[PDB]
Amino acid sequence: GLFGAIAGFIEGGWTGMVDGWYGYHHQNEQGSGYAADLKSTQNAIDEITNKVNSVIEKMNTQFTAVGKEFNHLEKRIENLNKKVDDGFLDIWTYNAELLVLLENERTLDYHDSNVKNLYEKVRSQLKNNAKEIGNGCFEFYHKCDNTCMESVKNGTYDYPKYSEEAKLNREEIDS
Amino acid sequence: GLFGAIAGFIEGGWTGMVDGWYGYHHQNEQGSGYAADLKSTQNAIDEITNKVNSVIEKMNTQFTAVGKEFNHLEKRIENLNKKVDDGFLDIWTYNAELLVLLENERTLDYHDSNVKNLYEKVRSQLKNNAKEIGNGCFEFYHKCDNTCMESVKNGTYDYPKYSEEAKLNRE
Amino acid sequence: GLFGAIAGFIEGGWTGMVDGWYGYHHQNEQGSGYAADLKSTQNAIDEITNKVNSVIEKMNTQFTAVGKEFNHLEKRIENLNKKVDDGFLDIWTYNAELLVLLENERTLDYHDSNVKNLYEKVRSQLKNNAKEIGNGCFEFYHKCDNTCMESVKNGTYDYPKYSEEAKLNRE
Amino acid sequence: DTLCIGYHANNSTDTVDTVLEKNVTVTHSVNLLEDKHNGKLCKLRGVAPLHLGKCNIAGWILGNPECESLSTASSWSYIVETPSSDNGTCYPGDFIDYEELREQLSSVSSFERFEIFPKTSSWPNHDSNKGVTAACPHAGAKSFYKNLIWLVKKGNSYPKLSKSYINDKGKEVLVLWGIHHPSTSADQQSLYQNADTYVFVGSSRYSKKFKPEIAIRPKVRDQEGRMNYYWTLVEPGDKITFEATGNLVVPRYAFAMERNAGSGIIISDTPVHDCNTTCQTPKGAINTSLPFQNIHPITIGKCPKYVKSTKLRLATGLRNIPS
Amino acid sequence: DTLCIGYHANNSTDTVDTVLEKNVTVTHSVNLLEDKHNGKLCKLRGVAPLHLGKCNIAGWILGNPECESLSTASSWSYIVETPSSDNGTCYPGDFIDYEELREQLSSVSSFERFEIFPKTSSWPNHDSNKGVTAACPHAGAKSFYKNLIWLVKKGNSYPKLSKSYINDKGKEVLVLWGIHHPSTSADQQSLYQNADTYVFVGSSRYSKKFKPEIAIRPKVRDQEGRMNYYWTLVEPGDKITFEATGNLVVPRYAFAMERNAGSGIIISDTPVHDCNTTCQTPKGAINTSLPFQNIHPITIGKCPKYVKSTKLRLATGLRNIPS
Amino acid sequence: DTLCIGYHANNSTDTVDTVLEKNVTVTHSVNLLEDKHNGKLCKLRGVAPLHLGKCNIAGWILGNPECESLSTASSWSYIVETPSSDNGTCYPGDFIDYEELREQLSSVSSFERFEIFPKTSSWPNHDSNKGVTAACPHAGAKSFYKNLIWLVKKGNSYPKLSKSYINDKGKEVLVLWGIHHPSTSADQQSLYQNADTYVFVGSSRYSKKFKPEIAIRPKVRDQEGRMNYYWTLVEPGDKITFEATGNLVVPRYAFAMERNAGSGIIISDTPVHDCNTTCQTPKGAINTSLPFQNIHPITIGKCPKYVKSTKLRLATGLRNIPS
């Protein structure tokens, strides 16, 4: 959609990452596996709960009877009251329905940016040190152990540390 | 706009691209012209047509007479009837007015989004085999024929086919 | 939040930039400081003012009395009148309250998108010429004086002029 | 070799307003506001309205000499009455619960006039022939309401009348009657002899004793006296009884009906046509195709919501940048 | 070595509708539409409804002999009638400002039935034992309402009646009374002797002189006579006087009560249960955690807004692409 | 050498609420909810309200001894009545269609008091000097309403009265009158002599015979009798006719007036000033601009919509992140 990540450059979901909305998959000499990005997942639960409450919280409403009884010689007031009942009904049905359609689009668009910003955040860290292979993947031009992998996921990737190894591998691949 | 494409890096629109909302201007050794991106255009059409149908179709409304007749000794009820009509008139007018304003802005952004997305999709395919020259333009380091050109459009572009050929021209 | 620039890659705001909403900060050889980007700040102000006038000016409304008076044997019409009053209150409160929430989120995203677009524009003009050092900053590989600096902001930055000057600065 | 990814522009001149800016030319956009109507009054739910001509509901329902008459079974979706409809209560007086009757008659599923108390056999002791007035003229002569008989004394005699009717129909019957209030005690004798009269009307749900109010009111349509108009809906099993010593303006024609799910009355000079609609406005009919309408606030049918806006066009295409 | 950024997919089958696509599968979602009701009429804010069984408001309040009356409750959040609730005014006539009274009585916070004019001491010169009718049968015998006394002549004598009640109750007192409208001159004589009678009733706010309208009405519950029902609320220190020379169905029981803000009457076959609710529907109580409901448009309570929606699913998670 | 990109941060402490985050400190913001008022009762439509002081509409229209009138405008935008306004109908009885008259007198574009029936000329056969009461005192002396004359017998005779007014003013004339209901036969005889009496009021639009109800009602301001209050608007060129044999409390003063658009009655203690406003609240006036308001539900004018929100703020600036 809107940010190009979800169902865009990152084709599909992961039934393997069960600990969060957004995260990572890795491969190294030690092993593979999925992990959720805590910082983004949490903030997003926090914000989505806020949005969910807001739609519900702001309602409040009065103590109302709704029903009114009118006699055989009070059809005009009885119809006036149905007009009030029907008019509010049309207001509430239309708004509820439009609010939900517009906000469901805005929610998915939000999950798209979260996944897009996550890709970009890493791309900014690794720079020259990894190859962007598409599908939201990076192929490290250097040896990236569970520790190194964790540094990236935690947003503390040390680019000058792996630079030399990555420059020689890249320069050999590009050769 | 919001995504930087429409009236941003892609300065203006093409009157020569009648076939769709979004697309390409191919320019190579064997003729030139405009072509619409079928997927992105059709997808957009469908989604927009849904957006339209949601706004119109969620309305419905039931049978009502609205009109009410009162005698000279029923002015307060006459006035209660007026307060109801004007109340609903104040609600619908402001809501419809705001729904059109707010929603026109979300639509133009959506178009800006499909243009920005398409731009990056092509960039991601070509990586370094083509130069970005602004106006949303890619200048090929290699010889992209009509079938090569008709691979970048449908997203089947072959980077290894031209990799080293482009590597040489770059220097 | 949305475009990952404001409180994203550009961690914080500049109190030192009284000039306008979005701008720059130069650090060369002849004095360092901030200056707003007019050809975006004015646009933002104009657009945001328009958004405000729309929320405000779309209201209008007619002259009404609201209050109704009813005898002791008119409780059902008294109560019907209260239903209209409470129904409109609940409608307007919920609407006003939600539009305020929804729209505040839209305005802030717009600011994020504007900063993202301003950063992207500069990165595009510069290219190889300056290094991306995170937090919206570009470290020039070449020498850029107070006039050269003004140009990058103006949307007029010649890449060839400093091409080799910056090429022989990558080690 | 070059490949530029770009967007569309065309000859389109459609301008929309967005939260962020007014008057933006778009490549494509749709209107959401119904601004046009047919300028005709149409059928609703495939049923034609009842047009009252030079009459109003009062004139119509009582038998006003200037009014049409529907001696046959009918049905209407709504009632059309022209702003210049003068022909109502020709003899002056109050039509009790008039706007209530108007609403109940607004739309009828089945409506049928029948001679409840036939003129020739119902009153062998009172004058059914006399009971014509200058107030209700017809083709330049003293006349009266078609659906009512102004019963009067039979040669210096007005015996007590007792007349009852059992609703043999299997639907409600609307009954109308009048109470004449003469101007003088001379008028009360001249018409009813009796002088100290009452009128009693009862059903299972209705009961009222009427007493003439004798006085000189200001002269309306050459009349110093008044006539009050009353009606009731007799249920199927039910019986309606009339008792009087004078002053009763007896029913002649009554109406069996099935009251249709509440509708309305349009007061318009717009001509009625053989068109069909889902939405009717006094000005003419509208398409319920679009969610909003700026035609008229008073509508009958399943209608778009009334709106003060002059334009509500939603952008569908993109910004039009010709270049 | 690879690092892949991705997003969560799951076992979720739930769908939401967006402005751009209808059936989008989401990983997580919240329903905003209360579609369920408990099928019971509950206590509204810890206060139980006044369930009238086979009786209606008129029946219960007049003390129709078929209605309990000696088992109410000092308070009620709302009243319940059943659609079949027939027992009301057993003697035919109009119950004046009836819906207004129902409205006033829909909710109460203090309610005490007390003998305003006790039977054995109030009427020493009038008969208070006869004045039972075939119109009101109960347990095989001619009966009458419990809350009223149909006073009739004390064997050939109906002297003038004049009796008042102050109000030492520190709240309004609901006083109901009836006006008997006999069928004939013979029925007037047999009940009251005095031919030309009147009833007068007055307080500081109320004043009406009633005159019986003797006339044969169509037989309803063996009656050609009628009885009109009247009520007034007598303020905390006001007096109500009862003056009559015949035709007074005198108040026997009245009600000290505090009217509670504003409730309603649910006409329903829904059984009453010992449950609490914030929102009551004629067909079951509803939770108020959600902003909307599609159960019933006519609710009593602090209620979600009724919508004609079948689904209002708000996405929380993302698009579920398990591919 | 470096060139950066960045955004504004300031001294601002103001927070907004977004859909995703509750307390957001923003650089700039605008308020959409009006919470300020002037505490004054202002000129709507360039016209000052009609402040009634200690009097209510009943007392002011009828010439209640504590109300003075006339010099109290010919045009008003709305009526100000205070919550403690006791001075109304000093003689007890019912004011028919009182709230209806209140709505109709709410805004007037022309108002002129005129003696419909000059005290001097109008009544040569009835007493116009006796018609004062302990119920309506002025400066500690039996008085009455200025706009009404309480006609009484002239030396043991109340001949039949007959008086008419033909509306020669260019507008509607509001005529008010009263029916006196004595407590006893003696009181009736001492005031009118006649005993079996009536009151008849006729117009083209209006007709009603009144029959006095002689009874001891509970004492309201030492009065065991009652005085019902009636009014009617006589269209230009129309005749209003009064006829009586007693119990008529004639009009003396009538009002030629022009009913204005759609205003109301503000019941408030808040002071009236020389301020010009477009929106009025019982609490004070709002100088609009904004679409929303939390001051009062009940308002008169081109007003903002009443919302229960205590804070409605639109962020215009961005998230303030100073550091």
Ligand SMILES: *[C@@H]1O[C@H](CO)[C@@H](O[C@@H]2O[C@H](CO)[C@@H](O[C@@H]3O[C@H](CO)[C@@H](O)[C@H](O)[C@@H]3O)[C@H](O)[C@H]2NC(C)=O)[C@H](O)[C@H]1NC(C)=O
């Ligand atoms: C309390 O509730 C019931 C239910 O409505 C009332 O009973 C019904 O009353 C009608 C009207 O009098 C009865 O009709 C009669 O039917 C008989 C057959 O026995 C017929 O031969 C008679 O000529 C007459 O038309 C009906 O049978 C009866 N229905 C039921 C369900 O009981 C009852 O009268 C009420 N009592 C009071 C005191 O309100």
Ligand SMILES: *[C@@H]1O[C@H](CO)[C@@H](O[C@@H]2O[C@H](CO)[C@@H](O)[C@H](O)[C@H]2NC(C)=O)[C@H](O)[C@H]1NC(C)=O
């Ligand atoms: C009847 O209705 C609801 C049922 O949950 C109760 O409402 C809550 O009341 C408490 C304190 O009484 C508040 O602090 C809550 O915030 C309320 N929530 C809702 C959703 O209404 C109410 O208390 C109930 N009455 C009884 C007697 O249990």
Ligand SMILES: *[C@@H]1O[C@H](CO)[C@@H](O[C@@H]2O[C@H](CO)[C@@H](O)[C@H](O)[C@H]2NC(C)=O)[C@H](O)[C@H]1NC(C)=O
């Ligand atoms: C005007 O209103 C005042 C309001 O109090 C009335 O005065 C009260 O009424 C009775 C009879 O006068 C007294 O016993 C009270 O103590 C009064 N209070 C005061 C302050 O006088 C008065 O009755 C009214 N006058 C008219 C003509 O309506």
Ligand SMILES: *[C@@H]1O[C@H](CO)[C@@H](O)[C@H](O)[C@H]1NC(C)=O
């Ligand atoms: C019908 O209307 C015209 C116009 O007011 C009038 O001249 C005529 O006398 C009316 N006749 C009846 C019987 O209503």
